[PDB]
């Protein structure tokens, strides 16, 4: 558990996922991350510097990490506290988190989420139901989370 997340921390360090920066909050605490989400290119969130933390559970390998995003973001996927829901961090097929999943399995579904975000029950409507109608003011709103995570 302690040994994995360590081995996986070290290899993200050492080779990222493209876009993310990943380290800890306590140097002596392996089961909470601070990671850097840049906003992906041809993305509403672009120059976006996104940071977010990873609650790992005592028991990682099955049993997947909570997700909760710090710096104002404005996603059909992010709810208004932060926190990021997707099928992969859910938690009794591949949709759901898996034992044989890593944090790199996580991050490039985060990549997803902000390229092309899952409706079927938001857990942002206010975002889900801006992006479908009123996409006119949704991006401009994208722009208030970029503009502000790069002056933060």
């Known amino acids: 558990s302690s040994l994995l997340l360590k ?3 070290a290899d993200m360090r050492r080779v990222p996922v493209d ?5 800890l909050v306590d140097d002596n605490d392996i089961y909470k991350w601070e990671v850097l989400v840049i906003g992906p ?6 120059g976006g510097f996104f940071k977010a933390i990873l609650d790992f559970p005592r028991d990682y390998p099955q049993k997947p ?9 404005w996603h059909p996927n992010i709810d208004k506290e932060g926190n990021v829901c997707i099928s992969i961090l859910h938690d009794p097929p591949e949709e ?21 975000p899952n409706f079927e029950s938001p857990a942002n409507v206010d975002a889900a139901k801006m992006q479908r109608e009123n996409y006119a003011e949704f991006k401009k709103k994208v722009a208030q989370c970029v503009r502000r ?4």
Do not use: C
């Not at 990490?65 to 973001?73: A, G, N, Q, W």
């Open 7 to 9: 081995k996986q921390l």
């Open 149 to 152: 995570s790069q002056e933060e």
């Open 96 to 116: 759901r988190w898996l034992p044989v999943h890593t944090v790199e399995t996580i991050l490039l579904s985060v990549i997803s989420m902000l390229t092309d």
């Open 19 to 23: 876009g993310f920066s990943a380290g």
């Open 41 to 46: 290119p041809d993305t509403l969130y672009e």
């Open 65 to 73: 990490p909570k997700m909760k995003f710090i710096s104002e973001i």
